[PDB]
Design a protein around this ligand. Structure first.
Ligand SMILES: Nc1ncnc2c1ncn2[C@@H]1O[C@H](COP(=O)(O)OP(=O)(O)O)[C@@H](O)[C@H]1O
Ligand SMILES: Nc1ncnc2c1ncn2[C@@H]1O[C@H](COP(=O)(O)OP(=O)(O)O)[C@@H](O)[C@H]1O
Ligand SMILES: [Mg+2]
Ligand SMILES: [Mg+2]
Lengths: 300, 414, 167, 152, 7, 363, 372, 187
């Protein structure tokens, strides 16, 4: 796996199992499954008031306030229809599937239920895609607190959409390797003839973050994507949203696989040094031939 | 706020993934990894260096058995990790693909067999603390969590904290006596004979007799024959005679699909119905080093614990693990144990002079609703309590002391 | 290399001034035969610990004795990436410390690696080849760590290209 | 299992209080009348004047190779290092070849004591000094450095 | 190069 | 002159009999192996196995044909040849650490065992009880006793120690021999007396040796220095600081010249000038031999291309640990045997060595 | 003594040495080779990649790739390996003990030198570095302070006029037309005789042929007629397998592309017109001083009789009262490096390095402010 | 050889006599350096005929046939085959490799197998390859006198190496993957 995926496996598995149990005609059993995801997201699939016939899937996010703004539920409503209900106490979004009113083709609703977090993110993000498509300059620009110490500053103009990631890693080894993994991020635009303008900075914050509360500091890195109307059109904005959504998690993932990569080269060099040491052991004059197990040969 | 701790029970034949606080593991995948392997020359540490990003072209779990062009490797053998490159890649896809956990926000509760060498714990700590950077780790013994999985199926008022746990998994069978909540570690027994030895024995039996089994599936068949037509016999030679004189009833048929041309092959399941599980009460059938039945090993385990905790240990022998799901396994175990115990009690009475007849020791073998994943649920209990976050090895402890923080477990003193 | 030539010549000449080891049974315990530099039980069987340094932060500490020599090496570490790589590499060297018969599973505090050559290693194995192994390690460790650094850079570039290609 | 009795009696290291341990003797005349070693003022005078060979010889004229005082030893070591690390890289061979065998056996000690506290370029010159002193004196000098019981 | 010519 | 490698593991110590036809060596284990000279080849004739730890000192009394062996099991044994087998008699040393060296007296009435218990054990016989008993010399000693060598007058005893000092004790036992005659070392000779104690405070003392006439005592240090104390000159010390690796063994081939060896693997010769009181490096005895190279086969080429991706120009490939005088005594020697940590046994010759090098003059 | 390193690091041949010498210490082709087969023999030299002369020696079983293309670095994972092999295998000196003096062709992407500085500081931790233009170093090596350099580098050709030490950055001209393009052209025109060279190991043989038999014609049409009318201009070369080839007319058609890019299907003008235009770009009152101080450089100007052709072309172009003097030293192949060994050794230059702390303060973009 | 031995007058036709013919071949047959010259010689004088005794007392005499049997190796047109001889096969194999290594292959030609034990086959192979290779390449035919066992001798060298323990096909690895593992573990 190189690119992180956007659909959660536990949601899909649990809902598909419940829908298979309901479609076969078996009586429904209880369900109470709580789990998490990337960026501190918390999922909870349960039943409302012990009602074993309804399954409610709730999600608690970190961009709590940006999703409550007016117009931040157009995509969620459009995709989820009647499944979207009032949030469960303590959570932020909540779907409600009735196991007796499930439409046919139960694969589509489960495929769209595993992408609940991606859809909550794309709903608060397509606002600026539309602010740019409709040909209006100076539309609202905000800061999505998609994590707790990192921010994503989104701005929409007449001809572009600027996304500035203010990012910082927790561990010291991760910080030291992330400096490299972020310095070398402008060398990617040589792999495709059409890639958004990427700018990296850790000396000083960009001039977009001087009127806003996006996280700044001397340990934070700033990565600016400039998505043009060839990356934010009504046909290639799904991939763009997926990538802008999973960028930080993908960088973290590959920072943590770089170590398991380096370990193999270190083992190789360790063996190469052992081979240089081996020149010190005087070769024996006669060895006793043994067996696969290691016992005496028992024969000539 | 806090996020639930991740529980990853890594067993030899199957790994159970989940988030602590639930009732059953979110995933149960095979503990296998499919990587691209070709014909090369040189050492193993040298042909594993993949150029570019080709070291991320691998799969794990169910998605690694389907791949017909990849080579499937099993990193864990007998519960002891023999390959750490594959184990690190397996762990990284377990964390970043299935659990989807950010390993810096979740405490981790891994598992281990009793006789895991300390260097394995040190390597696991090095992996989880320096590569994945978990804020805390806890490596609990596997069978001791299996005790707290029998409480969901037993009546109220008889859920005890004392019992002998028998965990028979894919690679190892260990016996752990727990008393009042304290693991009696110096009495734990550990035998590397388990499910996979039964599967090798059964395939060797089928291959010496049957014909028509495709070679590339000769193992996959010996699992479907073992986990379907296998039972336990009260006597061996009597069962051989019962199969010889009335073969028309005791000999079954197994019909499988050759997954290359989709044709169907049929084989006869005969003696390997009862010879498979018999390597539990005759371990010499699969490994000529061990010669001691499982009832005698359990009796030695219980007879080595303190005296006044011997009688409750006999009363709550809890089975766990998949390899104990053989029909009438607990029955034969309890029968042999009752024989041994009653004989010992009668000998003690005779030696006493014949004045007192002591209370017959109640022997019970507890099969419950959670055996197949009894370990994981136990973890899901321990990793859901507050006190859990007081027994983990914090990241500070590792940054200060090093991997040697994880070097001790309750099987050895000092 | 050619910038470590006098430093390595001095280290090699100090190595074969020690490593003149002899068999010796312990004095503070009945029949044990233990390396006298590790236990530090008798102060009369311990030679002066000599340091040979090329600059402030690259050095070799040699602690001699009558039946053992402890050679601790503090390697060059220019920045944080080289520090991380040197730590991980020395750790992967310690892991196999029974194939390296003269190695030590834990480095002396303050130093990056440590070898412990007792008298059995100079009776059963070639002495000049042990000296050659130590000097070859000191020659090639910097080069190997620099190649590790270049490998990390290449991995970062490939990851960036694999991401920015999908847009 | 684990031990539930007091095992603190194992932490006390009685071997450091032994009465048959090895104690390094020193001469009574070498303990009473301490030698102050070189005269630093003479060395700075001979260095300002610009004669390197005579300042070198005045640094090795007399040494605290008999005292037990740390201050005099450190001061003498400092002066001889100040002389050694200030030679031109060319006149080292000539200065070395003007010493008796004991002169070399002491210069090697003053060298191996200059590696322990190095500066920006002290070791880069002490290595050349070691090269020449080993060319002249051989491994025997390094061994008389290792097996010494009083350090200078 | 990036545009025009290869390099 | 020859070289014979008995084994690949070190030889702790060796001893010859009177007619130099048999040798007793230590294979670096508990056993003592007695080989016999049969024509040109050696054949092991006896194995003596009674020790619990590896032997560290063997000595063969020529006139009585009794072997004495001391090992790291804190015990000593006296082997006598009954008919065809060597039978051991146990000696009670009463030490609490491993023994290090053993030496018969010249008259074969007692023997000295230097041990790591900071004592010397002078063992003798009690024919009233058939009891091998021992007395202790332990006053000025503060470390292990490494090497021993007896005075020709059967009383004085030179002992080197790990306390950097060479000493000359008086091992007079007043129940096996008469009061000795006055020597230039001193007139008062009670048991345990200290006749001489060197002034060195650097480097251990690996080997001490008395002169042929018992008027000079020479020794070698780990400090690379070889020293000689003369008794006819108010016990004056003449030292020579070598520029090679240290020495481990030495002997007196004449009253003026020494043959030492050590961590260099080749024997060197020193000379003493009594008219000036100073040692002189007589020079290396061995001629540097050119070791022939061998072409590699295909099985060995691949075996050492897969596994590993002579340097020394002497007979011994490891340090020489013991030098004995084969024939000629110490007044005019003609053959000396060296054994080292490579299992080899080099029987040298003084005449051939003096012939090969004409720049080599033996004082 | 401690002295700055001078690394030419051209497009086709990496030349490195110490400052203060009169010859580069190490000279080797800047190529990286990787095997394209699978070993079968156990323990016999299984390593990832060969670089430098080792790759040339084992070029039969490797695929060779050049990191620098047309004076531009197009593969950094290989340029890093090139510099690593230069530091630790050829010069055998620690990189963080000496300042470095790198070279770059003029009119080049700023990202190139920015990444050069970033690599030299973050990876190798050199205490100081500098990136000078190649033509300026060539002029320094020539030993004068005025003239027009024409560095026909192997990877790239460029002309840089200089007057009294005042470079004119508006008259510099760059032409991506040099040794590698001539090698490819020779490979393309050798097929007429019947010799087919496709793989890279064969391109190396073609370069060895070019570097040995090719020569520039004083008059193209005359030489063509002579080669067509008489078989007295053919030469014989032995490939490294025993085969013998005989090339005639081709000999002077390969280097003739330099003066007629139309052969290679380019719209550009020959190097003679390039130099003339770069001269006419300057103000008139100095042009004469340039006409008499035209300096050649680079390994592509080693063809026999190129000075004569250049002088004839420029004399035909320039007015008939200016003295044309093509300064072509017989050591030109290393002039770019030689001037380096001079510039890094001067005493008035030791304040023009890019110190490590300057970079740590101002980012890698300081190369544009410090280096001209 | 069984075919051409009839023209003389001897008929071996059963599979038990093929062994006799094989012994005749490996004891008498040899390779002629110049085929036509040797043919004209043995056809003009009885100086090449050799006599072999069958296991029942009969003696047979073979002349021209002696070098006609192995000559089939260098021109299979005798057996009615189209493929080139072994010398041209080796030369083609060499010419298929890249140009930079051929010179190193020419000087390192190695023979093996018991069929290359014919007297005077190294000289024939050298004389034949030298006619096909450029006049500047040096052709070395490294034919050791232990060529018949060479394939085994290299095996013992290989199976005695240290790293070879990492190239086995362990029984466990087969028990889980069937016979399809040899194509992954062994080229
Ligand atoms: N119902 C069953 N009957 C018999 N054997 C079983 C059954 N289920 C699983 N097994 C065996 O047990 C092993 C898997 O059980 P598990 O407890 O997951 O072991 P582990 O946890 O060590 O992988 C396999 O070898 C399988 O063949
Ligand atoms: N004598 C020569 N005649 C013709 N071409 C040559 C000659 N010598 C070298 N070359 C070619 O010119 C180039 C050498 O230029 P060089 O000075 O190495 O610059 P760079 O460092 O850019 O390669 C090579 O491509 C080579 O093939
Ligand atoms: Mg298990
Ligand atoms: Mg150039």
């Amino acid at each position: 796996m190189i690119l992180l995926e956007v659909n959660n496996r536990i949601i899909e598995e649990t809902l598909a199992l419940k829908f298979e149990n309901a479609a076969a005609g078996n009586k429904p059993e209880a369900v109470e499954v709580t789990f998490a995801d990337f960026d501190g997201v918390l999922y909870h699939i349960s039943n409302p008031n012990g009602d074993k016939t309804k399954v409610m899937v709730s999600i608690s996010l970190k961009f709590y306030k940006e999703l409550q703004a007016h117009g931040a539920d157009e995509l969620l409503k459009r995709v989820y229809g009647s499944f979207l209900v009032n949030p469960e106490s303590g959570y932020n979004v909540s779907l409600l599937y009735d196991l007796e009113n499930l439409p046919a083709s139960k694969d589509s609703i489960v495929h769209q239920a595993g992408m609940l977090k991606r859809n909550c993110f794309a709903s608060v993000f397509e606002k600026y895609f539309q602010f740019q498509e409709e040909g209006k300059e100076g539309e609202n620009r905000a800061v999505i607190h998609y994590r707790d110490d990192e921010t994503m500053y989104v701005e929409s103009k007449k001809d572009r959409v600027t996304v500035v990631f203010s990012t910082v890693f927790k561990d010291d080894d991760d910080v030291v390797i992330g400096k490299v993994f972020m310095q070398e991020f402008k060398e990617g635009r040589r792999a495709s003839h059409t890639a958004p303008q990427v700018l990296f900075s850790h000396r000083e914050p960009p001039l977009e973050l001087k009127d806003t509360d996006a996280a700044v500091g001397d340990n934070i890195g700033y990565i600016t994507f400039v998505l043009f109307p060839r990356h934010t059109n009504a046909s290639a904005r799904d991939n763009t949203i997926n990538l802008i959504h999973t960028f930080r998690d993908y960088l973290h993932y590959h920072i943590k696989c770089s170590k398991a990569y380096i370990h193999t080269r270190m083992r190789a060099k360790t063996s190469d040094f052992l081979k240089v040491l081996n020149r010190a052991r005087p070769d024996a004059e006669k060895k006793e031939m043994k067996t696969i197990t290691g016992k005496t040969f028992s024969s000539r | 706020g806090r996020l639930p701790a991740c529980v990853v029970d890594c067993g030899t034949g199957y790994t159970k993934l989940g988030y602590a606080g639930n009732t059953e593991p979110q995933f149960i995948i095979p503990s296998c990894i499919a990587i691209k392997e070709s014909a090369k020359v040189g050492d193993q540490a040298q042909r594993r260096v993949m150029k570019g990003v080709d070291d991320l072209d691998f799969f794990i779990g169910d998605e690694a058995i389907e791949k017909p062009t990849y080579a499937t490797k099993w990193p864990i053998r007998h519960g002891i990790v023999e390959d750490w490159d594959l184990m690190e890649r397996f762990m990284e896809q377990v964390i970043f693909k299935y659990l989807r956990a950010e390993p810096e926000d979740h405490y981790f509760l891994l598992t281990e067999p009793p006789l895991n060498t300390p260097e394995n714990r040190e390597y696991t700590a090095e992996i989880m603390f320096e590569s994945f950077n978990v804020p805390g780790l806890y490596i609990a013994v596997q069978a001791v969590l299996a005790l707290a999985a029998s409480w969901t199926s037993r009546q109220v008022g008889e859920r005890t904290l004392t019992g002998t746990v028998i965990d028979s998994g894919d690679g190892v069978t260990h016996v752990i006596p727990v008393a009042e909540g304290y693991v009696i570690g110096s009495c734990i027994k550990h035998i590397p004979i388990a499910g996979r030895d039964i599967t090798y024995f059964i395939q060797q039996l089928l291959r010496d007799r049957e014909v028509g089994i495709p070679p590339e599936q000769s193992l996959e068949t010996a699992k479907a024959v073992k986990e379907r037509y296998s039972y336990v016999c009260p006597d061996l030679v009597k069962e051989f005679n019962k199969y010889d004189t009335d073969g028309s009833k005791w000999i079954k048929q197994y019909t499988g699909i050759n997954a290359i041309s989709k044709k169907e092959f049929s084989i006869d399941v005969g003696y390997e119905r009862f010879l498979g599980p018999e390597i539990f009460f005759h371990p010499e059938f699969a490994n000529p080093d061990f010669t001691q039945p499982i009832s005698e090993v359990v009796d030695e385990v219980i007879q080595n614990c303190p005296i006044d905790v011997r009688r409750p240990l006999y009363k709550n022998i809890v089975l766990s693990g998949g390899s104990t799901m053989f029909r009438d396994f607990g029955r034969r175990l309890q029968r042999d144990l009752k024989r041994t115990v009653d004989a010992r009690l009668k000998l003690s009475e005779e030696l006493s002079g014949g004045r007192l007849k002591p209370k017959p020791i109640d022997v019970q073998v507890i099969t419950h609703h959670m055996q197949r994943y009894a370990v994981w649920f136990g973890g899901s209990m321990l990793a859901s309590t507050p006190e859990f976050y007081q027994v983990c090895h914090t990241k500070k402890d590792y940054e200060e002391i090093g991997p040697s923080i994880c070097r001790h477990n309750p099987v050895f003193g000092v | 290399t050619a910038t470590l030539r006098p430093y390595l010549s001095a280290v090699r000449a100090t190595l074969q001034a020690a490593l003149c080891l002899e068999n010796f049974s312990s004095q503070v315990v009945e029949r044990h035969n233990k390396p006298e530099v590790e236990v530090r039980s008798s102060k009369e069987l311990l030679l002066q610990p000599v340091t040979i340094s090329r600059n402030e932060k690259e050095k070799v500490l040699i602690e001699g004795s009558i039946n053992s020599v402890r050679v601790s090496i503090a390697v060059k570490q220019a920045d944080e990436i080289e520090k991380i790589l040197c730590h991980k590499f020395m750790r992967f060297m310690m892991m196999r410390a029974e194939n390296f018969f003269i190695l030590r599973r834990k480095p002396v505090e303050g130093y990056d690696i440590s070898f412990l050559i007792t008298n059995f290693h100079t009776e059963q194995m070639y002495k000049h080849k042990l000296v050659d192994f130590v000097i070859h390690f000191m020659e090639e460790i910097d080069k190997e760590i620099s190649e590790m650094k270049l490998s990390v850079n290449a991995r970062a570039r490939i990851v960036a290209e694999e991401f920015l290609k999908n847009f | 299992a684990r031990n539930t009795l007091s095992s603190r009696f194992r932490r006390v290291d009685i071997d450091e209080f032994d009465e048959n341990k090895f104690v390094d003797e020193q001469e009574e005349a070498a303990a009473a009348a301490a030698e102050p070693g070189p005269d630093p003022s003479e060395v700075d005078g001979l260095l300002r004047q610009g004669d390197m060979l005579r300042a070198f010889h005045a640094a090795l004229r007399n040494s605290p190779v008999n005292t037990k005082n740390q201050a005099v030893k450190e001061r003498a070591q400092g002066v001889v290092l100040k002389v050694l690390t200030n030679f031109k890289s060319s006149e080292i061979e000539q200065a070395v070849q003007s010493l008796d065998r004991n002169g070399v056996d002491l210069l090697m000690k003053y060298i191996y004591k200059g590696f322990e506290k190095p500066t920006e370029n002290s070791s880069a010159v002490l290595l050349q000094w070691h090269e020449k002193a080993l060319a002249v004196g051989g491994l025997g000098s390094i061994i008389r450095v290792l097996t010494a019981r009083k350090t200078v | 190069w990036x545009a025009x010519c290869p390099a | 002159m020859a070289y014979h490698s008995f084994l690949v593991e070190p030889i702790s110590c060796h001893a010859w009999n009177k007619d130099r036809t048999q040798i007793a060596i230590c294979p670096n284990n508990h056993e003592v192996h007695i080989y016999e000279k049969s024509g040109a080849k050696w054949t092991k004739v006896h194995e003596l196995k009674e020790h619990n730890g590896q032997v560290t000192g063997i000595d063969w009394a020529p006139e009585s044909n009794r072997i004495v062996t001391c090992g790291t099991d804190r015990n000593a044994y006296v082997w006598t040849l009954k008919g065809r087998t060597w039978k051991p008699t146990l000696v009670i040393l009463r030490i609490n650490r491993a023994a290090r060296c053993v030496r018969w007296a010249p008259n074969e009435n007692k023997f000295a065992v230097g041990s790591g218990s900071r004592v010397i054990s002078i063992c003798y016989f009690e024919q009233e009880n058939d009891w091998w008993v021992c007395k202790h010399i332990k006053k000025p000693i503060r470390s292990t006793v490494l090497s021993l060598d007896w005075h020709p007058n059967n009383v004085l005893l030179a002992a080197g120690s790990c306390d950097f000092k060479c000493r000359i004790f008086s091992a007079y036992i007043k129940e096996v021999e008469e009061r000795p005659a006055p020597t230039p070392w001193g007139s008062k000779m009670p048991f345990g007396e200290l006749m001489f104690e060197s002034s060195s405070s650097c480097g251990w003392v690996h080997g001490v040796c008395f002169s042929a006439s018992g008027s000079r005592v020479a020794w070698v240090s780990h400090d690379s220095t070889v020293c000689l104390a003369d008794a006819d000159k108010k016990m004056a010390v003449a030292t020579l600081a070598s520029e090679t690796l240290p020495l481990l063994a030495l002997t007196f081939i004449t009253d003026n010249s020494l043959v030492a060896a050590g961590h260099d693997c080749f024997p060197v010769l020193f000379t003493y000038d009594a008219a000036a009181g100073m040692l002189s490096f007589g020079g290396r005895l061995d001629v540097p031999k050119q070791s022939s190279q061998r072409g590699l086969t295909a099985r060995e080429r691949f075996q050492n291309l897969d596994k590993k991706a002579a340097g020394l120009d002497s007979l011994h490939k490891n340090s020489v640990s013991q030098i004995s005088v084969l024939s000629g005594g110490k007044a005019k020697c003609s053959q000396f045997c060296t054994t080292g940590m490579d299992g080899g046994m080099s029987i040298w010759d003084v005449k051939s060595l003096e012939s090969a090098l004409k720049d080599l003059k033996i004082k | 003594d401690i002295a700055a390193l001078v690394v030419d690091n051209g497009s086709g041949m990496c030349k490195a040495g110490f400052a203060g010498d009169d010859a580069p210490r190490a000279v080797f082709p800047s190529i990286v080779g990787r095997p394209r087969h699978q070993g079968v023999m156990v323990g016999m030299g299984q390593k990832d990649s060969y670089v430098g002369d080792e790759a040339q020696s084992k070029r039969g079983i490797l695929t060779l790739k050049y990191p620098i293309e047309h004076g531009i670095v197009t593969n950094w994972d290989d340029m890093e390996k090139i510099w690593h092999h230069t530091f630790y295998n050829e010069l055998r000196v620690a990189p963080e003990e000496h300042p470095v003096l790198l070279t770059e062709a003029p009119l080049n992407p700023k990202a190139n030198r920015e990444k050069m500085t970033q690599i030299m500081f973050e990876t190798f931790n050199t205490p100081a570095m500098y990136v000078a233009i190649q033509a300026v170093l060539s002029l320094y090596a020539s030993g004068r302070t005025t003239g027009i350099v024409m560095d026909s580098g192997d990877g790239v050709t460029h002309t840089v006029p200089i007057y009294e030490g005042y470079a004119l950055p508006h008259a510099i001209l760059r032409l991506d037309l040099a040794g590698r393009d001539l090698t490819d052209y020779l490979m393309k025109i050798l097929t007429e005789r019947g010799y087919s060279f496709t793989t890279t190991a064969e391109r190396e043989i073609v370069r060895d042929i070019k570097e040995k038999l090719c020569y520039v014609a004083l008059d193209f049409e005359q030489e063509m007629a002579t080669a067509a009318s008489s078989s007295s201009l053919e030469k014989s070369y032995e490939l490294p397998d025993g085969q013998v080839i005989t090339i005639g007319n081709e000999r002077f058609r390969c280097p003739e592309a330099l003066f007629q890019p139309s052969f290679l299907g380019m719209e550009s003008c020959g190097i003679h017109e390039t130099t003339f235009n770069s001269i006419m770009k300057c103000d008139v009152d100095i042009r004469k001083d340039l006409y008499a101080n035209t300096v050649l450089s680079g390994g592509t100007t080693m063809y026999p009789g190129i000075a004569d052709r250049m002088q004839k072309e420029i004399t035909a172009l320039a007015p008939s009262t200016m003295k044309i003097k093509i300064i072509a030293p017989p050591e030109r192949k290393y002039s770019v490096w030689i001037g380096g060994s001079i510039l890094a050794s001067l005493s008035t230059f030791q304040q023009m390095w890019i110190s490590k702390q300057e970079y740590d303060e101002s980012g890698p973009s300081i190369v544009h402010r410090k280096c001209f």
